[PDB]
Amino acid sequence: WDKDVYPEPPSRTPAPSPQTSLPNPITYLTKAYDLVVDWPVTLVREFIERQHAKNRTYYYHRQYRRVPDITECKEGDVLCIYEAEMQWRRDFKVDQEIMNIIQERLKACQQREGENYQQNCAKELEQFTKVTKAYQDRYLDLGAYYSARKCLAKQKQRMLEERKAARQE
C-alpha cells in the first residue's frame, strides 16, 4: 500500500504483438469476466464506499512517549523497573514486526525476480542479513523470561568482549 515501506517496481508489460490470424480465448473471456463480475462488484463497492462516506469515523495510533530506560533505574525500585520493562517489551514486539516486514520484502522480491533472483535480489538479502545479525546481537540467546535486564547484561558482555579486542594494538 505505502510503496515506500512496501516497494514494488513498476509492472512493465510488453505489448501483445500477435502473429496469428486466429483468436486468443484469454482476452474475450477477460471481457466477459469484466462486464459480468467486475461491474456489479464495483457497483456494490461504490455503494458501500458512499455509505461509509455518509457517516465517516476515524481512529488513531496511540503514540507512546519514551520513559526513563532501565539503565537510569535503581536496583530494587520496582516501579521504574516495571515501566522500563514495559517500554522494552513494546520495542521488542515492534522489532519482531520489523523483521517480518523485511522477510516479506525478501519473499516478494524473490517471486517477482523469480528465476534470475540471485543477482538482482541481493539488496533485500543484505537488508535481511544485517537486521538479522542485529536481532542476534540483541535478542537471540535469551529465553522465555527475556527482559530489559537480560538484554542489558548481554550487551554489556559483548561490549566487554569488544573492549578486550580493541585493546590489541
Q: What is the DSSP letter of 65?
A: P
* Torsion sign, CA atoms 123, 124, 127, 128: negative
> For residues 64 and 111, what is the distance between their CA atoms, to the nearest angstrom?
36
> For residues 55 and 57, what is the distance between their CA atoms, to the nearest angstrom?
7
Near other proteins by CB under 8 A: residue from 76, 114, 164, 167: 76
Q: Is 74 in the site for other proteins (CB under 8 A)?
A: yes
Near other proteins by CB under 8 A: residue from 71, 111, 120, 129: 71
Q: Is 156 in the site for other proteins (CB under 8 A)?
A: yes
> For residues 122 and 4, what is the distance between their CA atoms, to the nearest angstrom?
18
**Shortest spacing between CB 95 and other proteins, in angstroms:** 19
Looking at the Cβ atoms of 70 and 121, the one nearer to other proteins is 70
Q: Is 72 in the site for other proteins (CB under 8 A)?
A: yes
DSSP character string of 32-52 = HHIIIIIHHHHHHHHHHHHHH
Of 98, 94, 163, the closest CA to residue 130 belongs to 98
Looking at the Cβ atoms of 27 and 71, the one nearer to other proteins is 71
Q: Is 9 in the site for other proteins (CB under 8 A)?
A: no
Q: Evaluate whether 154 touches 161 at the Cβ level (below 8 Å).
A: no
Q: Is 150 in the site for other proteins (CB under 8 A)?
A: yes
Q: Is 97 in the site for other proteins (CB under 8 A)?
A: no
> For residues 5 and 97, what is the distance between their CA atoms, to the nearest angstrom?
13
Q: Is 106 in the site for other proteins (CB under 8 A)?
A: no
Coil, strand or helix at 15: coil
**Ranges within 122-141 binding other proteins (CB under 8 A):** 141
Near other proteins by CB under 8 A: residue from 30, 73, 95, 124: 73
Near other proteins by CB under 8 A: residue from 49, 133, 153, 162: 153
- Contact positions toward other proteins, by CB under 8 A? 70-76, 141-143, 149-150, 152-154, 156-157
